[PDB]
Design a protein around this ligand. Structure first.
Ligand SMILES: [Zn+2]
Lengths: 101, 201, 245, 190, 549
């Protein structure tokens, strides 16, 4: 998603030259810019697996508090199972907070 | 006499072609991959054999040496069926396929083998100490006579039930007034397999 | 396009264009009007679904009243949202593939654009955001490579667009790459009015293409899958005579 | 998208998607004929059939809508004419009697079969295992014919009149690269 | 009762009226971890709610503290809450400080408690409309007198009525904690009333009902005929799924271990013939010889063991077991077969599940233990489906190992004679020994205690005394103590089965903790299991000796 995700790939990014790091920052700038224009409705950094099913089982991987969604709220209790819509949790799954697709 | 052999071969072929777990026919895929890489062999797990049917396992348990060749020729029949086109009627360089078993029965130590285990399937473990060099064994012999001078072919299976188990040479000729056994072995145009001996301690 | 018979025709054209671009070894033109219609369609459909969902929600939360009947309520909007997700996936894949392609051939298309005799202009093949992407990315990469290495290079060979000496550094697309095709025939329902197709024994209308290197002639019939090099087939593809697979 | 050269061919998921994007016949369980209610009003499918359906009458809907209704109890998928023993028998006979031409079979071969076997296990008239075995036999026979035909690979072109989707997809890279190398050699020689 | 069995479906409908939504998880379920019936009921409910596409979430908990914390974590968006396997015998309102006026709107968020323990709170039933349960059919008949006093008690001569009401309430209380019905049985009754019965539901019902054979044989014998009739009401192609009533025996993994090891480890035969010393083994060998099975043959796997004697095993047992009096080992059970995969039985499957729950994979260590328990529970849950069998073979082998370890420790206990016979209740403490780290699990400790009480019952002693068992974990320096009730011999008539033996240990523990400031921690959903300190154990025990039981 063009955010470099230093909080959670490599941890230090020290194995890259300074010129490479500023190039990476510029590319992240372009990535953020591209989806801000005519294509605002479609996230270019979304998934690439074709949507095949609507309801899937989701099992928690890391603990957090509660997270709101549209018309509801999900509480990320540690090590529980959800029966939720596919098109809601792909962002979390890419973040690594959910498992067992 | 032939009807029992045909029934047994048909049953084994049905087991090979009909066994499936989930959505996979395991043994057919094994045969395909084996034929592709020129490993003419098949591996049977005994638990699958028991689960599919128990009577075939009983027959394999009773008389192993009499039964195994039927299975090892049913395998080659199925392989010819599912690897070569009939083209509405060639090389056919497919020998008899080797059958290899695996099981998980109770181990029996060497010193516990006695007269009650004769002609039975047993499982054991030891240590290997000495290995002999390779040797040749005939499976398809071209046989020629001297007086009548006709050609014949003898097919040899490598399994022995009795100590002899060998038809040395047919008595008399095939139809004049030849000798007892006027036959010779034509060394060219014959098929040979490899054999080795091992010692266990 | 000039007008739509139906949005489903638009969807079919979009899917065919995506398939053609995925396997093509050369950057194809940009179908502006199709996505011009499609983005408006998506926005209007999203507005409608949001409006109806908000209506259900606020009639439910203003008072307990009666919950919506489970039949004819959940499944229709479920279908709408899943179809919208599917279409968004398709468009995203198409756009990302085009972005990668323009990533690969950046210098070649830039050097082509400045050519005055070249009748093809960069404006048609690319969208405006793609143009800004290309130019900004090229400048960024040139700055990086100039700072890292070219600063130490002698005056003779500092340029990264040299086309002299031993090896040229412009990656032209491989026009000869073998591709899988399916002879769809003429888009007309008559499928017999083209001045190009001929006939053989038992009818079998066919097109005759020629390869200059092999000095041969190859026959292509309707309903047959072939494996043919891309160079001899550009015109049939751009005229929608044959569809790649 | 690149993601390790995924920009040159199709993944099996994309093939499954592009196959489920196809129309099929259905046998509905419920009725939603208009009061003479919510409009379906989709954007990539004629909603007229969806709006105008009545129970126990055949109608055509796209595949994934039928699958979704089959996940609920509002559906009854009607199998095509392929998925029966007496048609597969004549098909396998045709392959056996013609050792050079692939039998006539559509692009969606074996994919609709997999999907219907996975989901619509109960609506068939034939036992599932028989059909699965016959389909496996067809797969093996066509695989053998493909290996036989692949022996000769001209540098000019080739004709594969009756290959299905997955069979082309799996073989695309090897064939393409081999002919590319051969063409490069020939062109370099001149 | 609040919800009779004749109205369960109505409550189901209520859920659909309140929780069935599009983009809002409006139903959360709490499950009593470390219990089999709760797991079976949860699986049935998960399948049912996956059918109608009702979004949901499953939450495992271990102790009342976690219940309180997670309830505090809840949000008002949750219209309906489920609790299964606990929370019956305590007042949740006094527990979770529910304000009835806060939730009235109706009372908004409904909570469904579903448990089986019979000494369950009277106020929690008759005083609250926010809390609402599924009676098994107990209030309509048994509580026909207790509710009158509560209704009355919710001019100087009227004190007699107050005294009578107080006496009635006291008489109702001060009783042991028992279980008289299975959760899965009620769930399957609801399923049958609806019309969604199938083979998976029947299998889960059978598992739930047969998990109680060890401790509640009376309940098992009451519930068996319904299962038999239901399974009667409902060429070997590779898709066959057969459920059968085949004879089966009280044998530890008969169809996966050798017959010799099966007899050797079977708890009933152990109790009947004292196999922990030499005479037991001698009698076992005599039994095998008189049967006629060779000692080399009987030590082979059940698959490869001889077919003829496999067929004749029933007749062999019938003709031989009478002399040793073990004929109570033969019973009728259920067998499930899936094509060519093999055969399995309910007892073997539940033992595998129990072992998988036991083994898998100060305050901080306690939290780590309580979280690995939940992880093991979820692993056992995933093991249920038919697409996985590598999570069942492992369970079977671990069950073998755990039974071996339990037998090895029990023989040492009975050899050292650590069982001290006091005036009221027997006592034994595992001060030192091997493999003590395993017994930190309450279910493992209960298994050990079940074997011990079986052994004690199968003797010439004519005294039925409660048993107290303790362990030690040097890391925490605490004693884990569990109270066990006596059990009648299994081969006993039903006339001397008027009432099951109750359990007063929870009441005794709570009274002692209320009257003295011991350093205990009573947080297990099973109220008969507590944790105590090493220095605090002995005086505490003295108190328990001197207190009225
Ligand atoms: Zn002769």
């Amino acid at each position: 998603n063009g955010l470099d995700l230093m909080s959670s790939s490599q941890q230090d990014t020290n194995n890259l030259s300074h010129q490479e790091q500023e190039y990476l920052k510029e590319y992240c700038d372009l990535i953020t810019d591209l989806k801000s224009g005519d294509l605002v409705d479609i996230d270019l950094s979304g998934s690439l697996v074709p949507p095949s099913d609507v309801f899937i089982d989701v099992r928690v991987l890391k603990d957090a508090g509660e997270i709101q969604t549209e018309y509801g709220v999900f509480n990320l209790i540690k090590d529980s199972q959800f029966f939720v819509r596919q098109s809601d949790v792909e962002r979390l799954i890419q973040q690594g907070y959910l498992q067992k697709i | 006499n032939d009807d029992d052999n045909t029934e047994i071969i048909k049953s084994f072929k049905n087991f090979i072609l009909e066994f499936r777990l989930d959505s996979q026919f395991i043994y057919r895929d094994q045969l395909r991959n084996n034929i592709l890489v020129k490993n003419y062999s098949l591996t049977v797990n005994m638990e699958h054999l028991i689960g599919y049917n128990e009577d075939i396992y009983k027959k394999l348990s009773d008389e192993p040496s009499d039964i195994i060749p039927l299975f090892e020729t049913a395998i080659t029949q199925v392989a010819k069926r599912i690897s070569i086109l009939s083209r509405a009627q060639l090389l056919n360089s497919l020998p008899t396929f080797q059958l290899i078993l695996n099981s998980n029965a109770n181990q029996i130590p060497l010193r516990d083998l006695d007269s009650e285990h004769v002609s039975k399937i047993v499982r054991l473990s030891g240590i290997i100490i000495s290995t002999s060099v390779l040797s040749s064994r005939a499976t398809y012999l071209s046989i020629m006579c001297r007086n009548c001078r006709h050609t014949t072919s003898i097919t040899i299976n490598n399994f022995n039930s009795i100590t002899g188990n060998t038809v040395s040479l047919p008595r008399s000729c095939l139809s004049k007034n030849c000798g007892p056994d006027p036959y010779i072995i034509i060394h060219e145009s014959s098929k040979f397999i490899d054999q080795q001996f091992l010692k266990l301690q | 396009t000039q007008i739509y018979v139906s949005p489903q025709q638009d969807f079919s054209d979009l899917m065919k264009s995506w398939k053609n671009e995925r396997c093509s070894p050369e950057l194809l033109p940009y179908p502006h009007q199709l996505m011009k219609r499609l983005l408006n369609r998506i926005s209007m459909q999203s507005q409608l679904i949001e409006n109806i969902s908000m209506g259900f929600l606020d009639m439910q939360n203003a008072s307990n009243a009666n919950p919506p009947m489970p039949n004819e309520s959940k499944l229709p909007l479920l279908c709408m949202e899943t179809e919208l997700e599917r279409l968004k996936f398709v468009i995203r894949s198409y756009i990302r593939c085009r972005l990668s392609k323009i990533d690969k051939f950046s210098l070649y298309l830039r050097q082509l654009n400045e050519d005055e005799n070249s009748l093809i202009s960069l404006t048609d093949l690319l969208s405006k955001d793609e143009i800004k992407y290309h130019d900004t990315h090229s400048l960024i990469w040139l700055k990086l490579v100039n700072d890292s290495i070219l600063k130490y290079m002698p005056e003779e060979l500092q340029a990264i667009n040299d086309t002299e000496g031993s090896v040229n550094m412009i990656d032209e697309p491989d026009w000869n790459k073998f591709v899988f095709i399916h002879v769809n025939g003429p888009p007309d329902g008559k499928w017999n009015e083209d001045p190009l197709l001929q006939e053989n024994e038992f009818g079998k209308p066919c097109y005759t293409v020629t390869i200059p290197d092999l000095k041969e002639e190859v026959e292509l019939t309707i309903g047959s899958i072939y494996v043919m090099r891309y160079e001899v087939i550009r015109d049939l593809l751009r005229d929608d005579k044959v569809a790649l697979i | 998208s690149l993601p390790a050269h995924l920009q040159q061919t199709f993944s099996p998921e994309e093939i499954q998607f592009i196959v489920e994007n196809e129309p099929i016949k259905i046998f509905p369980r419920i009725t939603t004929r208009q009061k003479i209610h919510t409009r379906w009003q989709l954007i990539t499918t004629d909603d007229k059939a969806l709006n105008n359906m009545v129970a126990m009458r055949s109608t055509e809907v796209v595949l994934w809508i039928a699958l979704l209704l089959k996940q609920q109890s509002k559906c009854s998928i009607v199998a095509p004419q392929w998925l029966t023993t007496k048609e597969l028998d004549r098909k396998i006979q045709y392959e056996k009697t013609h050792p050079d031409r692939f039998s006539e079979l559509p692009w969606n071969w074996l994919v609709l079969a997999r999907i219907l076997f996975n989901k619509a296990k109960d609506d068939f008239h034939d036992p599932i295992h028989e059909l699965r075995g016959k389909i496996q036999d067809l797969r093996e026979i066509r695989q053998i014919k493909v290996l036989k035909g692949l022996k000769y690979l001209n540098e000019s072109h080739l004709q594969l009149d009756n290959l299905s989707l997955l069979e082309i997809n799996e073989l695309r890279p090897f064939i393409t690269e081999i002919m590319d190398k051969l063409r490069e050699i020939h062109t370099a020689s001149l | 009762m609040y919800y009779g069995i004749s109205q369960f479906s109505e409550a189901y409908n209520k859920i659909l009226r309140n929780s069935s939504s599009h983009s809002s998880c409006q139903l959360v379920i709490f499950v009593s971890c470390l219990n089999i019936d709760a797991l079976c009921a949860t699986k049935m409910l998960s399948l049912l709610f996956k059918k109608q596409l009702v979004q949901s979430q499953i939450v495992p908990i271990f102790g009342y503290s976690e219940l309180r914390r997670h309830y505090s974590q809840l949000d008002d968006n949750i219209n309906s809450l489920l609790l299964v396997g606990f929370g019956g015998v305590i007042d949740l309102e006094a527990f979770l400080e529910i304000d009835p006026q806060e939730y009235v709107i109706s009372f908004r968020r409904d909570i469904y408690v579903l448990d089986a323990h019979r000494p369950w709170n009277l106020d929690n039933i008759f005083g609250s409309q926010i809390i609402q349960c599924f009676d098994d059919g107990t209030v309509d008949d048994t509580l026909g007198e207790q509710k009158e006093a509560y209704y009355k008690l919710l001019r100087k001569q009227r004190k007699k009525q107050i005294h009578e009401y107080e006496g009635v309430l006291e008489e109702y209380y001060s009783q042991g904690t028992t279980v008289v019905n299975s959760i899965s049985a009620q769930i399957y009754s609801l399923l049958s009333a609806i019309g969604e019965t199938n083979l998976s539901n029947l299998w889960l019902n059978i598992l739930g009902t047969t998990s109680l054979d060890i401790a509640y044989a009376q309940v098992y014998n009451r519930l068996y005929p319904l299962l038999q009739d239901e399974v009667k009401r409902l060429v070997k192609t590779p898709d066959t799924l057969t459920l059968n009533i085949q004879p089966d025996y009280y044998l530890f993994l008969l169809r996966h271990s050798s017959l010799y090891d099966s007899f050797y480890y079977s708890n009933y035969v152990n109790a009947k013939l004292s196999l922990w010393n030499e005479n037991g083994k001698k009698r076992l060998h005599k039994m095998f010889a008189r049967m006629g099975i060779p000692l080399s043959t009987a030590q082979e796997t059940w698959l490869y063991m001889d077919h003829s004697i496999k067929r004749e095993l029933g007749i062999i047992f019938d003709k031989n077991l009478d002399r040793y009096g073990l004929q109570d080992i033969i019973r009728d059970g259920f067998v499930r077969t899936l094509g060519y995969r093999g055969s399995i039985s309910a007892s073997e499957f539940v033992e595998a599940l129990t072992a998988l729950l036991e083994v898998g994979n100060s305050a901080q260590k306690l939290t780590n233990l309580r979280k690995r328990w939940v992880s093991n529970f979820w692993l056992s849950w995933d093991a249920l489906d038919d697409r996985k069998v590598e999570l069942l073979n492992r369970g079977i082998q671990l069950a073998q190992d755990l039974q071996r370890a339990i037998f090895n420790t029990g023989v040492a206990i009975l050899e050292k004679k650590l069982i001290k016979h006091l005036r009221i209740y027997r006592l034994c403490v595992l001060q030192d020994g091997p493999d003590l780290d395993l017994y930190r699990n309450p279910l493992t400790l209960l298994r050990l205690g079940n074997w011990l009480i079986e052994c004690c019952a199968e003797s010439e002693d004519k005294q039925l005394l409660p048993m107290v068992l303790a362990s030690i974990d040097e890391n925490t320096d605490t004693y884990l103590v569990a109270g066990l009730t006596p059990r009648y011999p299994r081969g006993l008539d039903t006339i001397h089965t008027k009432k099951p033996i109750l359990n007063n240990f929870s009441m005794a523990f709570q009274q002692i903790t209320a009257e003295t400031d011991a350093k205990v921690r009573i947080d297990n959903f099973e109220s008969s299991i507590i944790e105590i300190r090493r220095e605090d154990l002995s005086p505490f025990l003295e108190k328990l000796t001197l207190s009225g039981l």
